[PDB]
């Protein structure tokens, strides 16, 4: 039960005179039918969104949204739906973004209170899993060969390395540190560059990333190109560091 | 940049292009020029490529990281997204992979950055970027409000001459890291909701600070619209406080 004060609500009433609102029903119907046609933006505090949020939502708090929106959503025509606890703070957000030139903004009347008053589905932050990414990764792992960090490190340390090692992380990740002697070939660029770099498609190639996941996807892709001896390092450089294996910076 | 793409890569690209929708760089340019862009415009190139310039209205999600990031960054599987790369080839692989994950409202920009520049269309450098509308709002607020320096606030606190209530209007995570000793956390998000209960006397002197002086200026302007007549924003924020080697507090 909120006890909103008169001066706050005067600001809210003024904002609501200028911005478009929709119902929680509109959001729920678009969610259920997979027809949501804008960004759905939770403007509540970090401590509020930790207790659950509306499906398909992203977080940009009212406190930071003006300072962040032009970098995060440069397109002034982008359709955006805002909600907060009760439909009042989100009206102020939509009106400020309208003032900045984002006119395709909608505030969700009633907000989180109305959403839960109708019993609509919610999600916890702890519940989030990148399910489709992990499905793609498991799809790749079924098709490829993998090798542990211990097996690779033991080969390197024993001067029995039997393949080329590529770090398929981003520039910034590789630059901070990498497995010593690894060659940087980002997953973004690997299919473009591999045939010029490694024309022998039977050459043994080890790929690693942060976790074993991006490298598995990259290895599947190289197999589609006819590379027959690609190996992904299970657990990636995270598992490598967990085993206290060493890393190097250029 | 003249590219020499290998046959194996282009077979993958041909397979991807057979399953995804493409548009032209003209379509992107026409939507940009008329402010009618109707989806996210996503540059899938490497960090080192985007650092040399990019297409207006674009955001960056490299092909290397996009599958690992998309469900957190764009949870809505119906979100319309346009992808571009150097030449329309990597971006087709990206669009096809996101389609495989259930993001069907995806389009690859045929010809990519190379066709964009071949037609002489406008580009942005990363160093050109300025949050112009945010800075306009801040200057808008500063015109109307009172400000004082970090040194004025510091001297007042250390003289036991503190004449106002001090609010940190940053986010939860920022306040919990460290704050000016004794300041009450009242986020800019919640300040209008809570201020009348915490400060019923609208002539009570109130100091607001944030990281830079920018959010507190916006918050101070909003408090004035509610009839608070003695709000003061700390120019330069807690960054200028630290710049003067003034100490901070946890808990
Ligand atoms: Mg596959
Ligand atoms: Mg104003
Ligand atoms: Mg404290």
Structure tokens that stand for A160 in this block: 């029995």
Residue A20, SS3? strand
Give this entry's resolution in angstroms: 1.8
Q: What are phi and psi of A195, to 5 degrees?
A: -70, -30
Nearest by CB to A195, which of B8, B44, B227?
A: B8
The answer to whether the CB atoms of B57 and A63 lie below 8 A apart is no
Q: Which residues contact A73 (CB under 8 A, 6 or more apart)?
A: A39, A80, A102, B59
Give whole-number Cα distances, A34 to A41, B73, B75, in Å. 17, 17, 11
Tell how far the Cα of B177 is from the centroid of ligand 3, in angstroms. Answer: 10
Annotated binding residue A178? yes
Asked if B44 and B63 count as a contact pair (C-beta separation under 8 A), the reply is yes
The sign of the dihedral angle between the CA atoms of A233, A236, A237, A243 is: negative
d(CA B246, nearest CA chain A) in Å = 25
Residue A209, SS3? coil
Nearest to B107 by CA among B124, B95, B99: B95
The answer to whether the CB atoms of B189 and A61 lie below 8 A apart is yes
- Interatomic CA distance for residues B212 and A70, integer angstroms: 17
Q: Where are the beta strands (DSSP E) in B53-120?
A: 58-60, 81-84, 106-109
Structure tokens that stand for B120 in this block: 């002489």
- Which of B:47-76 have CB within 8 Å of A? 47-48, 56-59, 62-65, 67-68, 70-76
Residue A19, SS3? coil
Asked if A233 and A212 count as a contact pair (C-beta separation under 8 A), the reply is yes
Candidates A22, A84, A147, A209; catalytic one: A84
Annotated binding residue B5? no
Ligand nearest to the CA of B221: 2
- Max CA pair span of chain B: 76
- Which of A:159-198 have CB within 8 Å of B? 168-172, 186-189, 191-192, 194-196
Cross-strand bridge partners of residue B167: B184, B208
- Interatomic CA distance for residues A202 and A155, integer angstroms: 19
Give whole-number Cα distances, B63 to A220, B66, B181, in Å. 15, 5, 45
Both ends of chain A: CA-CA distance in Å?
Answer: 57
Long-range contacts of residues B135-141, Cβ cutoff 8 Å, at least 24 apart? B135/B214, B136/A100, B137/A66, B137/A96, B137/A99, B137/A100, B137/B218, B138/B214, B138/B217, B138/B218, B140/B221, B141/B217, B141/B218, B141/B220, B141/B221, B141/B233
Asked if A200 and A184 count as a contact pair (C-beta separation under 8 A), the reply is no
Q: Which residues of B touch A73 (CB under 8 A)?
A: 59
H-run or E-run covering A143: helix A131-143
Tell how far the Cα of B82 is from the centroid of ligand 2, in angstroms. Answer: 35
Give A178's DSSP letter: B
- Interatomic CA distance for residues A188 and A181, integer angstroms: 20
Structure tokens that stand for B173 in this block: 């995570």
Q: At what angle do helices A190-197 and A213-224 cross, to 10 degrees?
A: 60
Annotated binding residue B179? yes
B102 has a chain A CB within 8 A of its CB: yes
Q: What angle do CA A107, A63, B216 make, to 5 degrees?
A: 130
Q: Which residues contact B15 (CB under 8 A, 6 or more apart)?
A: B96
């Amino acid at each position: 039960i909120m006890q909103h004060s008169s001066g706050f609500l005067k600001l809210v009433d003024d904002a609501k005179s200028r911005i478009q609102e929709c119902s929680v029903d509109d959001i729920q119907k678009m969610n259920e039918t997979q027809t949501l046609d804008g960004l759905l933006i939770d403007t509540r505090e970090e401590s509020e969104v930790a207790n659950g949020y509306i499906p398909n939502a992203i977080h940009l708090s009212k406190g930071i949204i003006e300072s962040a929106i032009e970098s995060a959503v440069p397109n002034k025509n982008q359709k955006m739906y805002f909600y907060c606890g009760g439909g009042f703070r989100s009206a102020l957000v939509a009106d400020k973004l309208r003032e900045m030139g984002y006119k395709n903004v909608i505030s969700v009347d009633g907000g989180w209170r109305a959403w839960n008053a109708k019993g609509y589905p919610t999600v916890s932050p702890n519940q989030f899993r990148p399910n489709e990414f992990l499905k793609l990764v498991n799809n790749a792992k079924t098709q490829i060969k993998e090798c542990s960090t211990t097996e690779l490190y033991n080969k390197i340390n024993s001067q029995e390395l039997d393949g080329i090692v590529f770090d398929v992380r981003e520039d910034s990740e590789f630059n901070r540190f990498h497995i010593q002697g690894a060659t940087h070939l980002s997953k973004g660029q690997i299919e473009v560059k591999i045939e010029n770099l490694v024309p022998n498609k039977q050459q043994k190639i080890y790929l690693y990333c942060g976790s074993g996941f991006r490298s598995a996807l990259a290895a599947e892709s190289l197999q589609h190109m006819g590379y027959t001896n690609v190996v992904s390092i299970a657990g990636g450089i995270k598992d490598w560091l967990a085993n206290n294996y060493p890393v190097s910076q250029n």
